[PDB]
């Protein structure tokens, strides 16, 4: 069903972050801006000093609560017949034995080191764990240690 299924995800938040622009993007196929606006969330949710500055400290991932991960989460997974999402990257991480460069090439992140963004694929053809992005390397840690998918 693919774009229907992006519908169906019940769209929550404990910071009252409005997920229906990239639900939207989501849905009608339209991954370059959904990774944008999912980006521009997660520094929404990170709090004011994140959003002050307009990155995120590996440090602040803690504050973001596990609904708002695990809506975002819903949806890429929603959006991809669970291909992409922050739990397949979790998963992707832990069968390669936490081994981070073993990991980047299983994502396709370097098929080199894929340059952003012209160099990525956004699109239902990219590898399972391919999206979302996040680019150190203790940040997206941090993301996949939360415990929204631990689990």
Known sequence: SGKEA?????????????????????????????????????????GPEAVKRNWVYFTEVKNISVTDFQTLDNLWKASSNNKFGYSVQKEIWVQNQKRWPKFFKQID????????????????????????LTNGTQLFQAIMEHPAFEK
Not at 10 to 37: C, K, M, P
Not at 123 to 132: C, K, V
């Open 6 to 46: 992006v519908m169906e995800v019940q769209l929550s938040s404990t910071a009252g972050i409005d997920y229906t622009v990239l639900r939207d993007h989501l849905a009608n196929g339209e991954f370059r801006e959904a990774e944008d606006e999912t980006r521009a969330l997660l520094i929404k949710l990170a």
């Open 109 to 132: 992140w370097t098929q080199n080191y894929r340059k952003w963004p012209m160099e990525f694929i956004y699109s239902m053809d990219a590898p399972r764990g391919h999206l979302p």
